[model samples]
Target: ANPCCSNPCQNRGECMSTGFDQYKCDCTRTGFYGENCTTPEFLTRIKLLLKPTPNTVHYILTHFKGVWNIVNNIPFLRSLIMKYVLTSRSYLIDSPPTYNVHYGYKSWEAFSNLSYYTRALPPVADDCPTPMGVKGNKELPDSKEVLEKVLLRREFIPDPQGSNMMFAFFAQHFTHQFFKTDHKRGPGFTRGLGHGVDLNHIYGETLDRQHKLRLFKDGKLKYQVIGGEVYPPTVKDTQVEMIYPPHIPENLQFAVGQEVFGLVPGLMMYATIWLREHNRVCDILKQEHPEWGDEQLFQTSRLILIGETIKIVIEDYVQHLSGYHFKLKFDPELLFNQQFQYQNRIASEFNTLYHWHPLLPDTFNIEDQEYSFKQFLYNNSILLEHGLTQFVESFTRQIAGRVAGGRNVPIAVQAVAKASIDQSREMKYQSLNEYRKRFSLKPYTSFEELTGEKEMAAELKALYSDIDVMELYPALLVEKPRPDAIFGETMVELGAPFSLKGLMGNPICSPQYWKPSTFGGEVGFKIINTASIQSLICNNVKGCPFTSFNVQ
Candidate 1:
């Protein structure tokens, strides 16, 4: 009864014995299918579908209820098809197979709120660890056991060609730490100058001779346990000029005395003064070059040295501290103190990022601010909705007909599902595109000829028309001002945007620098907040998740 019993048929066609003493053949090749693989028309139809028919409408009507179930049943169907369309790629899932917590309405909203709240510097206190909320799976209860089970079940995933699910599964904790710890270790340069220096230090509030000696003694001894060996007291005899990090000897001159301990005051003085100067540099850089971002400015040679110092100091001091201040250094701890300091320090004046912004019922004291994502949708929903509809119409045009959604179902029944599916697809595209386009602009294409100019204009016009330009252009993509207090005498300043309410009963927010046109018109964007919401949704799904079938 085995069809593959003999190679009697030509071209690797498998041969089998029929009960009536007749032989049946099954072909194995790209063009064959079905039990004995006699389905030639199916292959021909597929070839035809692969070839695009210009100017024709591709109607993809997706069935709502059982679509995912149908997809689930077909092993590797969507993944194989996506290969042709180039639709699949990597994504971060909360869990694999059983419960994938990706970017969704609520999750998207949760992060949006969190980004906004985080933008506002948490009080620098040793209160509680970051309040309980979503972190990556590592912080989740029973993650090890859960991950083991998920790893075993990983083979059941239909698309191995997609993101390495195992990598994402294990890397969730690492990635979460990447974003969360970015706040603390982020202020490396600023903190490198040391926290002991106050605003007076920059104003030439020289430690008075007696006070300076006492403070210098105290400062030197403070690090004696860790750094080892106090510098001799004779170093204070030379000029008190500031010395910045990247402290090569060429950039140095002996102050007070040349021996290490003799020059301790000068080193301490240079450390303190250089930090103030670094702050001034950062402020100046922020004001002068608003375009250069936090990372860019922070990564400078001078800044890196400062940051490295901060890391060393933090590690040296509380690296071993297991208590409140230590916990404040990372996420899931109370607002600031140890955990949230770096995040707050890295907070640019222009924008904020929300991974978890839960507004306790009484926190904001705003009674009517009972939030929902619908309002966010309502705010810019029409533009995205329209843009999505247009995208779907065009998408279906490219892949229309039965293949689009009307083939298997009857015409009348397919029409209804087609409309709904198209709608969902439109929603998906709009949300996805909105996030992609938010706070970002297209590269300028210089029109070389009149025809080119006309084409470019039309393209730009279409691009502008496809988005809610008004909502996104001004708020989400504008560059605004900064407070003088923040902009005062430092190389850079950071701030947060005025807030908005979003879905999931949390506030959507942003952060950015203070210069206009640094981004465009606002210091930071509202769109990133919107994108944060969308990011939460997309994080749950995979691929260019604007399409219904594109959901992972």
Candidate 2:
């Protein structure tokens, strides 16, 4: 009997009989490469470009970093060098589970379908390690119990690299752009509009909500001056949704892009900066072109602001994360000619992987007063009373917890950890070793190798009985980082693809949209280029003399 007779191979993969009741799938030229040829070719290519082996590409890049040091100052040289790097690496993984992504888009036939989420890597084999909390007949250790024991922050541990509260706050704010989950749609389904990072978190996910936030007067999202300082306008009335509790006073509530922004003062502070920036840009555009209508002013100003945002994240925030000395650039045009579609969809795994609650400290100190985790929720009074400058200074001076195991989310917010645990199990992700192998790294042979801490190793070893069964999300958080790097190997492997692919696939990065005209000419273009973590805070919040992710 021939194994190929059943045509078990998919995606036109050639099936060759290797032995009795056995076969091999020749995935070459198939555009798919998993056991059944279900995986996309471009993902394999992306893995090739991104994961640099130390003896080869890593060695090359290490030396090239020094050369970039000298020539990075020259604009043309910088553009050329960065463009080459971007062209090689920035492949966008798109959606619609019809076929494997070809050259980073549709392979055979792709209808313009946009699902809320896609798998970062293919889901693991079902029933491979049996159900959660169990392996075959033996009931595994209670996962929920394991998480509580491993992650809960019994005491504050500052980040090894001196990252501050602002860093944590900024991450929460930015990811909300497309990480908006549709709770009604269940875990993994998103509330996002199925686009790239266009600041939906600061502009509401729906058009109707966006309309209420917009003034239509000067192309500005609504704001009010509280004691001569700009703040998100209070909602209090109307058939609008607010995240605040019912008993909270109307003055403390705010009508911002995302209703949940009101829940955290740090989030609101960022919301305030962008709101002021939009109106301020409008003022400048109004001065430059008085004849333009409100729609023109607003739309153009938006593109500029989004560009500014993309610039700051890549240049300042991501550079800090990368620990790479070669400054990262937001040159959207670098991907203009790449073999990728101009589309971005948040991955289901990423929704789980970004559970960085370990980095959040137990409390934030504002000016002279100390606020605990329970005290901070739905509390906007601290920001309103202290003002943005004082709040900025306080958070800047405050240290964030390290993002490793042993550290924990505050008891007040422990539910978030449980939710993350639920989401990861529901996603049915690949094993820790499987993810490591696919992400271009060696699989861990021992628990000690996975994390430097022995207690964690012992605990994990007892639960799984083998390193191969370790779950992706929890293990990733505890995984020891490369020397001086903030995140461990699994996190970088999983997160970098999500971050790079999402950012590079923004519509603004497309050839059609990446132009000065798209951003209201060169004046607006200059504004976009001028964006930085330090500058945006200082410009929007008066009396903010300096800003740093490094805690002073």
Point to the candidate with the largest TM-score: 2
Q: Which stretches of candidate 2 lie over 4 Å from their true place?
A: 1-26, 30-51, 54-68, 74-77, 91-115, 124-129, 132-140, 237-239
Candidate 1's residue-wise lDDT over 1-552, tens digit each?
222222234322444556644656666562555554546557667875675421111112112425544653565654343232211111111111110012212234433322222221111111212111111121212312221221112112121112221112111211121122223433111221111211222222244422322222111201111123122122233234433223323212222211121122212322232333333334444554557655444323132222222222222222221111111121111211221111221221122211101100111101223223323211222212333223222221221111100012222222333332232222111121222222122212221111122433343333333222211111111111111110110111111111101100011101122123332223222212122212222322223234221112
By TM-score, how accurate is candidate 1? 0.16
Candidate no. 2 TM-score: 0.86
Best by lDDT: 2
- The estimated TM-scores of all candidates read 0.16, 0.86
Estimate the Cα RMSD of every predicted model relative to the unseen true structure: 29.6, 5.2
Determine which window of 10 residues in candidate 1 has minimal summed lDDT.
Answer: 500-509
